[PDB]
Amino acid sequence: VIGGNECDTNEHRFLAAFFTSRPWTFQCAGTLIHEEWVLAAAHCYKRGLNIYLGMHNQSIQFDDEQRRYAIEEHYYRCDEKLTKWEKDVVLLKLNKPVSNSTHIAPLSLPSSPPSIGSVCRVMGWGIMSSTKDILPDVPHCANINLLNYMECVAHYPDVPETTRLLCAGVLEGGIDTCNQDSGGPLICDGQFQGIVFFGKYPCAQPNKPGLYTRVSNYNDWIQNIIAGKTTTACPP
């Protein structure tokens, strides 16, 4: 996250961190949405990653930190016509539930639709400088705006027209998500509305907002999987 500051230690209790085992290296983030389910981005997740809940400073282990791994890995396979840009979610079931604690609590799926002009919180351990690829040991937080999708469409020729992505950022530049913020939540007006996907590098350029996976498209699908539906998960 560029143009922000270190997050408050208690304002990201839903933020999950993915690590490889050896070496022990931060990969990306995810969102705890349920005591035993995490929602992440398909493009940065790979099998066997360690999942940490209740992490702030990567060099510190809080007394309530919990480590898990995925026992189930659900990709969105409902519409073969959707491009890779339109289905970048992975729903992970944890090997064991995590109870609430000082630094751990799930974030609910959005209960109202996203609205242009909202102020959106972004957070992550990703690159925090637009001039140097500096990765912090603590997560950084910042505010951006949910923008008209028109503000993004012209900058991503490779991405076809879609309704399944959100355009968010700061048009004057200076504030943006960057590499390895992938998978983190975009929280607009208190609602989990987006997942960090991709933008432009260098990051935080003027009039170069990023695209975010639109969470609300997946509510029914996620809830069905959590409810135990195997087949029947997708819509008819």
Ligand SMILES: *[C@@H]1O[C@H](CO[C@@H]2O[C@@H](C)[C@@H](O)[C@@H](O)[C@@H]2O)[C@@H](O[C@@H]2O[C@H](CO)[C@@H](O[C@@H]3O[C@H](CO[C@H]4O[C@H](CO)[C@@H](O)[C@H](O)[C@@H]4O)[C@@H](O)[C@H](O)[C@@H]3O)[C@H](O)[C@H]2NC(C)=O)[C@H](O)[C@H]1NC(C)=O
């Ligand atoms: C562990 O903590 C989470 C609470 O999540 C926190 O909520 C508060 C306490 C803040 O501290 C936030 O920072 C955290 O996000 C608990 O789960 C939440 O329970 C609360 C109950 O108060 C739910 O919030 C309410 O939801 C009402 C409707 O509930 C139903 O709909 C939602 C879906 O939107 C669904 O999640 C829930 O299961 C029911 O289906 C709503 O009318 C009300 O206005 C308010 O929004 C919230 O939905 C729960 N969140 C999640 C992610 O499940 C656990 O209760 C808690 N464990 C315990 C036992 O302490």
Ligand SMILES: *[C@@H]1O[C@H](CO[C@@H]2O[C@@H](C)[C@@H](O)[C@@H](O)[C@@H]2O)[C@@H](O[C@@H]2O[C@H](CO)[C@@H](O[C@@H]3O[C@H](CO)[C@@H](O)[C@H](O)[C@@H]3O)[C@H](O)[C@H]2NC(C)=O)[C@H](O)[C@H]1NC(C)=O
């Ligand atoms: C994320 O956390 C790390 C971990 O360091 C912590 O250090 C203490 C404050 C305790 O909280 C420990 O539990 C924990 O390991 C932070 O890195 C550390 O920063 C401190 C304070 O700046 C550094 O102290 C330096 O020590 C050297 C000698 O090596 C002197 O020359 C320095 O002038 C100064 O005393 C410490 O070196 C550094 N430690 C390690 C292991 O890296 C880090 O600051 C923190 N991140 C943020 C953003 O807060």
